[PDB]
């Protein structure tokens, strides 16, 4: 079942680990299994927890759903609209998911990351790390308190996906809608989010590519995760290097 490999040959020189997990049949495909075992804060791919959050408890409702946006100045071009949950999601919009989780008491979220087994499941750091400067941009999923292993976010990824929490069915196809994306190869669907952020402690990134892949019959859910020094080094980074790897050891 738990299978030991070597991926090394995607990952350019980069410092990282894979695993990818098709419940089914109980293969688990490991590369690096050390870093893979390690909690980090998820950064922007707790936006998939987050998304679903928001729809259980009604601060937003389909893929189209707004949160009122002020008129706040943002660097980020597509920031500064009323933009829906789906280009919120995929523009990794930090003012819309704060003020999105912002609108649920910490309680339900408490109970809700403990349902899921969501890593350490310490929101205790609600405002997240304020240290930075970044005020408001800021919580405890990004560089703060709230960490999680890439084997237990691919744990919560099945358990999400495979339709064995309690959230409704009609939420999780609006995360699978939304989390989509286009590797150009018909004969697989691809399905994931990136995140990205700095472990200041280690000087180390967190660069994330988690989700899951649909091929003939089979699905596996996966998580990319680098730990390297270079700065340099992003989600989008290594989520080229899982679709490498897709294309190479799961076509
Ligand atoms: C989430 O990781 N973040 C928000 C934004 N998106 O990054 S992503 O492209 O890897 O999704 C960039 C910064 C980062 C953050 N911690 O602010
Ligand atoms: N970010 C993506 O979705 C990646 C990056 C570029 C395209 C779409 N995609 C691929 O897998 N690509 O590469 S391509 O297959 O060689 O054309």
Request: aromatic share 12%.
């Amino acid at each position: 079942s738990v299978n030991i490999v070597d991926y090394s040959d995607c990952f350019e020189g980069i410092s990282g680990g894979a695993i990818f997990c098709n419940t089914k049949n109980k293969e688990y495909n490991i590369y690096n299994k050390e870093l893979i075992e390690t909690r980090r804060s998820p950064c922007s791919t707790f936006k998939i927890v987050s998304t679903l959050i928001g729809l259980e408890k009604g601060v937003i409702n389909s893929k189209e759903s707004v949160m009122g946006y002020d008129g706040t100045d943002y660097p980020n071009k597509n920031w500064n609209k009323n933009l829906s949950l789906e280009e919120a999601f995929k523009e990794s919009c930090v003012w819309y998911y704060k003020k999105l989780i912002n609108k649920v008491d910490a309680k339900s979220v408490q109970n809700i990351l403990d349902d899921l087994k969501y890593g350490n499941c310490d929101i205790s750091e609600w405002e997240g790390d304020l240290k930075n400067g970044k005020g408001h941009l800021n919580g405890f999923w990004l560089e703060s308190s709230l960490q999680i292993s890439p084997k237990e976010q691919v744990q919560t990824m099945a358990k999400i996906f495979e339709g064995d929490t309690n959230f409704k069915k009609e939420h999780i196809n609006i995360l699978r809608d939304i989390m989509a994306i286009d590797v150009n190869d018909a004969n697989i669907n691809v399905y994931g989010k990136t995140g990205t952020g700095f472990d200041e402690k280690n000087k180390r990134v967190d660069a994330w590519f988690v989700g899951m892949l649909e091929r003939e019959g089979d699905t596996y859910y996966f998580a990319i995760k680098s730990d390297d020094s270079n700065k340099e080094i992003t989600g989008p980074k290594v989520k080229e290097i899982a679709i490498n790897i897709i294309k190479k050891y799961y076509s």
